[PDB]
Amino acid sequence: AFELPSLPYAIDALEPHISKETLEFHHGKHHNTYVVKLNGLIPGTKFENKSLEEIVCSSDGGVFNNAAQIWNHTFYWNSLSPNGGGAPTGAVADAINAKWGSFDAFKEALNDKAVNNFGSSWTWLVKLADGSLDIVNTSNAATPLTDDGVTPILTVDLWEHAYYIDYRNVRPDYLKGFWSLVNWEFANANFA
Amino acid sequence: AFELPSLPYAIDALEPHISKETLEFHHGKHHNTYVVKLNGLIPGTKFENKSLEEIVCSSDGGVFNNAAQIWNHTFYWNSLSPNGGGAPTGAVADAINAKWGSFDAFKEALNDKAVNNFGSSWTWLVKLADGSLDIVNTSNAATPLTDDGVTPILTVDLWEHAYYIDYRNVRPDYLKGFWSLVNWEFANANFA
Ligand SMILES: OC[C@H]1O[C@H](O[C@H]2O[C@H](CO)[C@@H](O)[C@H](O)[C@H]2O)[C@H](O)[C@@H](O)[C@@H]1O
Ligand SMILES: OC[C@H]1O[C@H](O[C@H]2O[C@H](CO)[C@@H](O)[C@H](O)[C@H]2O)[C@H](O)[C@@H](O)[C@@H]1O
Ligand SMILES: [Fe+2]
Ligand SMILES: [Fe+2]
């Protein structure tokens, strides 16, 4: 049975960009529910003994939405940090300059993809087969984890539960907290 | 240019099922924003002089997302009332029993469709071409308004902004609020 991974930092730790209550609900309840639902769905199926990733990569319907949502949320928590934010560093900063010319252009491109990602969705920083970076949008539980040859680097959850408690309807304000939390170490580990 | 319709009731008329705060953000900001976006999109285009329903029935991409959304939300405020709730009456009560055997079986079927309607979505009570009632789920901005032979009767908004402020992650509590508010008078009008 799959389990809810612990949060990589205190429920307190992303303040004032993402609040304790958001983490309590977003991780403690939303994330957990996909874990629970998934565990309920696997018995009696060909997903009985496969790893999370194996299932997300081979399922559809209910098993997929729940499995992918677990993986996506786990990847999202890793994409934030009480010690992140600010300028990118390392391999990632250079690839960002290589693709977009500057960090600022990359940031304006991701903000634009993110605010316009209609409905419950996710905006991703991914590394392509050709080694280059790109920004791709997925809807609901969809994830580049299943795009062959594409490597997920960072993600921002845009389902409303992710920011409604702290930002109501204003995604840019949310995106602001995201940029003050971005976990460049996790980005660089995925990139390398 | 299109306009934000007024709410059919006072801002606190739906308390304690839907809070004045939710009404302020949902109707005053989200609903509004769809109107503003569509006004910002149709100038100079073919849609410029069409009615809202003509636009929804003839567009895609962003024009459709905003048009359908203004339409869906206006239908939704109408689907709630400070004087609704409790048992269905009239024509709709009888068609409900014709389809589901009883009002109680109908509630369980709608609740079920709505709690499992994944991501930003809407759950509708509809009248089909054979004259019978059914419940259908649409995603994001999609609406049965565009389905041939299908007439919208009532809708419950399941995008998280519709209930997060009041019910956080617990959709069944929000659906109990909906049942205390359902406008049978609007439903019987749509039906006849
Ligand atoms: O796990 C239950 C099902 O979830 C999805 O379907 C639900 O959500 C859809 C919108 O995302 C609705 O259109 C649909 O009516 C709901 O049943 C998934 O597509 C299904 O395969 C799952 O069984
Ligand atoms: O009007 C802008 C576009 O809105 C939609 O696309 C955005 O939201 C999608 C998810 O609903 C994302 O996948 C997409 O990347 C975003 O641009 C709509 O589907 C497009 O047709 C519109 O042009
Ligand atoms: Fe989430
Ligand atoms: Fe809404």
From Swiss-Prot, chains A, B:
It comes from Pseudoalteromonas translucida (strain TAC 125). It holds the Pfam family Sod_Fe_N. Keywords: Iron, Metal-binding, Oxidoreductase. Its cofactor is Fe cation. Destroys superoxide anion radicals which are normally produced within the cells and which are toxic to biological systems. This is Superoxide dismutase [Fe]. Its EC number is 1.15.1.1. Binds 1 Fe cation per subunit. The gene is sodB. SUPFAM superfamilies: Fe,Mn superoxide dismutase (SOD), C-terminal domain (SSF54719), Fe,Mn superoxide dismutase (SOD), N-terminal domain (SSF46609). It catalyses: 2 superoxide + 2 H(+) = H2O2 + O2. Gene3D superfamilies: Fe,Mn superoxide dismutase (SOD) domain, Iron/manganese superoxide dismutase, C-terminal domain. Homodimer. InterPro entries: Mn/Fe_SOD (IPR001189), Mn/Fe_SOD_BS (IPR019833), Mn/Fe_SOD_C (IPR019832), Mn/Fe_SOD_N (IPR019831), Mn/Fe_SOD_N_sf (IPR036324), SOD_C_sf (IPR036314). Fe cation binds at H26, H73, D157, H161. Belongs to the iron/manganese superoxide dismutase family. One of its GO terms (molecular function) is superoxide dismutase activity.
